[PDB]
């Protein structure tokens, strides 16, 4: 699901410039179990690739 | 006691400090990925 987020809402979050809030949400979700540190890194890297494009 | 090298003078925004605190609570002592995310 997290990956799907950056596959659909990554551009919208980047335009809104809420990438830090998205990372904070990922951290909270990981603290609530589900996802993982590797998942957080993968999602952030996918988000970064959107900005570079 | 160790790491006698003086720290580089780089300033941190309040958002940077708070998010560093959160990421330290998450990743603990893995400063590499913590810095990569910041």
Swiss-Prot record, chain A:
It comes from the Eukaryota. It is found in: Nucleus. Overexpressed in breast and colon cancer. Sumoylated, probably by PIAS2. Component of the PRC2 complex, which consists of the core subunits EED, EZH1 or EZH2, SUZ12, and RBBP4, and various combinations of accessory subunits including AEBP2, JARID2, PHF19, MTF2 and EPOP. Within the complex, interacts (via C2H2 zinc finger domain) with JARID2 and EPOP; JARID2 and EPOP compete for SUZ12 binding. Also interacts with AEBP2 and PHF19. Forms a monomeric PRC2.2 (class 2) complex consisting of at least SUZ12, RBBP4, AEBP2 and JARID2. It is linked to A chromosomal aberration involving SUZ12 may be a cause of endometrial stromal tumors. Translocation t(7;17)(p15;q21) with JAZF1. The translocation generates the JAZF1-SUZ12 oncogene consisting of the N-terminus part of JAZF1 and the C-terminus part of SUZ12. It is frequently found in all cases of endometrial stromal tumors, except in endometrial stromal sarcomas, where it is rarer. Imagawa-Matsumoto syndrome: An autosomal dominant syndrome characterized by generalized overgrowth, dysmorphic features, musculoskeletal abnormalities, developmental delay and intellectual disability. Some patients have genitourinary and structural brain abnormalities. Polycomb group (PcG) protein. Component of the PRC2 complex, which methylates 'Lys-9' (H3K9me) and 'Lys-27' (H3K27me) of histone H3, leading to transcriptional repression of the affected target gene. The PRC2 complex may also serve as a recruiting platform for DNA methyltransferases, thereby linking two epigenetic repression systems. Genes repressed by the PRC2 complex include HOXC8, HOXA9, MYT1 and CDKN2A. Belongs to the VEFS (VRN2-EMF2-FIS2-SU(Z)12) family. This is Polycomb protein SUZ12. It comes from Homo sapiens (Human). The lineage of its organism: Eukaryota, Metazoa, Chordata, Craniata, Vertebrata. The gene is SUZ12.
Swiss-Prot record, chain B:
Coiled coil: none annotated. Induction: Expression is induced by E2F1, E2F2 and E2F3. Expression is reduced in cells subject to numerous types of stress including UV-, IR- and bleomycin-induced DNA damage and by activation of p53/TP53. In the ovary, expressed in primordial follicles and oocytes and also in external follicle cells (at protein level). Expressed in many tissues. Overexpressed in numerous tumor types including carcinomas of the breast, colon, larynx, lymphoma and testis. It is found in: Nucleus. Phosphorylated by AKT1. Phosphorylation by AKT1 reduces methyltransferase activity. Sumoylated. Polycomb group (PcG) protein. Catalytic subunit of the PRC2/EED-EZH2 complex, which methylates 'Lys-9' (H3K9me) and 'Lys-27' (H3K27me) of histone H3, leading to transcriptional repression of the affected target gene. Able to mono-, di- and trimethylate 'Lys-27' of histone H3 to form H3K27me1, H3K27me2 and H3K27me3, respectively. Displays a preference for substrates with less methylation, loses activity when progressively more methyl groups are incorporated into H3K27, H3K27me0 > H3K27me1 > H3K27me2. Component of the PRC2/EED-EZH2 complex, which includes EED, EZH2, SUZ12, RBBP4 and RBBP7 and possibly AEBP2. The minimum components required for methyltransferase activity of the PRC2/EED-EZH2 complex are EED, EZH2 and SUZ12. The PRC2 complex may also interact with DNMT1, DNMT3A, DNMT3B and PHF1 via the EZH2 subunit and with SIRT1 via the SUZ12 subunit. Interacts with HDAC1 and HDAC2. Binds ATRX via the SET domain. Interacts with PRAME. Interacts with CDYL. Interacts with CLOCK, BMAL1 and CRY1. Interacts with DNMT3L; the interaction is direct. Belongs to the class V-like SAM-binding methyltransferase superfamily. Histone-lysine methyltransferase family. EZ subfamily. This is Histone-lysine N-methyltransferase EZH2. The lineage of its organism: Eukaryota, Metazoa, Chordata, Craniata, Vertebrata. The chain holds residues 421 to 458 of 746 of the full protein.
């Amino acid at each position: 699901a997290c990956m799907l987020f950056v596959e659909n809402y990554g551009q919208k979050i980047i335009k809104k410039n809420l990438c830090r809030n998205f990372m904070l949400h990922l951290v909270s979700m990981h603290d609530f179990n589900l996802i993982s540190i590797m998942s957080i890194d993968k999602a952030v890297t996918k988000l970064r690739e959107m900005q570079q494009k | 006691k160790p790491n006698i090298e003086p720290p580089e003078n780089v300033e941190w925004s309040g958002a940077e400090a708070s998010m560093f605190r959160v990421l330290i609570g998450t990743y603990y002592d893995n400063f590499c990925a913590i810095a990569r995310l910041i």
